[PDB]
């Protein structure tokens, strides 16, 4: 409905007790002008979990499309039973770092000229459908860093445990 919960608060690590220097960091997959973070495989429970998977999307060129895939609860039995995505209203709402904690923010207020198509393949542009996309504008004047969380770290299969996925989108100035 586009409203932000001003009281909501979280952290990159969540409850995993993993510190930022131990994250499994990795770049997005950048094909022409679509940058993708696919969490299908990265979040399945394993013996070594909980791990933090941090998919880093870095943009400094015009009209890039960002697509984030977060596997749905029950899309495969057992694997994603306890998965949670934050913010619920992504991509309209994102998270940003304010005084060392992650808080909700409107993406359109953060980057002027943002295109959000209401529908992705005739489906709602929302994580409840397993994917979100947006398109960055032709010109950006302010560096900007915002986050998505696709946390499967509360799913357990015996001694196997799912992972917490982070998307860090880092927009730099461009278009001059």
């Amino acid at each position, epitope marked *: 409905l586009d409203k932000i919960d001003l009281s909501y608060e979280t952290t990159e690590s969540g409850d995993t007790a993993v510190s930022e220097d131990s994250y499994d*960091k*990795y770049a997005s997959q950048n094909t022409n002008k679509e940058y993708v973070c696919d969490f299908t495989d990265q979040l399945k429970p394993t013996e070594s979990g909980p791990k933090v998977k941090k998919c880093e999307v*870095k943009v*400094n060129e015009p009209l890039i499309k960002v697509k984030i895939i977060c596997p749905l609860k029950g899309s495969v039995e057992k694997l994603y039973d306890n998965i949670e995505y934050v913010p619920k209203k992504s991509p309209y709402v994102v998270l940003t770092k304010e005084e060392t904690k992650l808080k909700e923010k409107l993406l359109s207020k953060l980057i002027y000229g943002l295109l959000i198509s209401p529908t992705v393949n005739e489906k709602e542009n929302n994580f409840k459908e397993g994917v979100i996309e947006f398109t960055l504008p032709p010109v950006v004047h*302010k560096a900007t860093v915002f986050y998505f969380i696709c946390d499967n770290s509360k799913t357990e299969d015996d001694n196997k445990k799912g992972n917490r996925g982070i998307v860090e989108v*880092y927009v*730099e*100035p461009y278009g001059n």
Partner: single-chain antibody
Amino acid sequence: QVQLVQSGAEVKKPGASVKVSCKASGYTFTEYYMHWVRQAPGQGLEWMGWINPKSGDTKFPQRFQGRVTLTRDTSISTVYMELTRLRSDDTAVYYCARGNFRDYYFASWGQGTLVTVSSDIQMTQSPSSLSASVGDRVTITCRASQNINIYLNWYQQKPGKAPKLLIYAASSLQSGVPSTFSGSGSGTDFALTISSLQPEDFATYYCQQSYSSPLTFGGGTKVEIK
């Protein structure tokens, strides 16, 4: 268009201090972190730390914690690097370099300031030196002691010049670079490949990891003429 201009050469006695400046023109100063990188004569590149100019926040590695202080003046888009208690092994050329996405790569470099004092991920490059000829295809290897995914960049440096960035993200060709250059690798092992050596590809080539702090450089693949 983007420019970073630094103070002149300094001559110091051991026990003194040195302030080096980096004026920025051509872009919005506050939107890009500024790092410092030094180079002893005939040696490799050593990262010194970064300042965020919106906030003044610094980040240093243990080698320079308490040795060096980074300040900035947003009034005039300038950054200062003060190094205290100078000793002879501090003789070197000090570069300010503008970070892209904080520290992903260093597209833009200053001209360097020579300071002349009187009297942890390892990057591994092979070969150390080589000789070749126009038209030859040359392959250089770089090797990380840890998985760094694609957080790897390649730089060309000519004598008396700041490093040019040629490749970032392991295999992205920087704008304005001859397409004879290419990069490959993901994880621990990387290759820089020049399809046809042209007369001004004769230089020293460096790889550099941006995965985790401190930022470290390979020690240099020098590419000579016969």
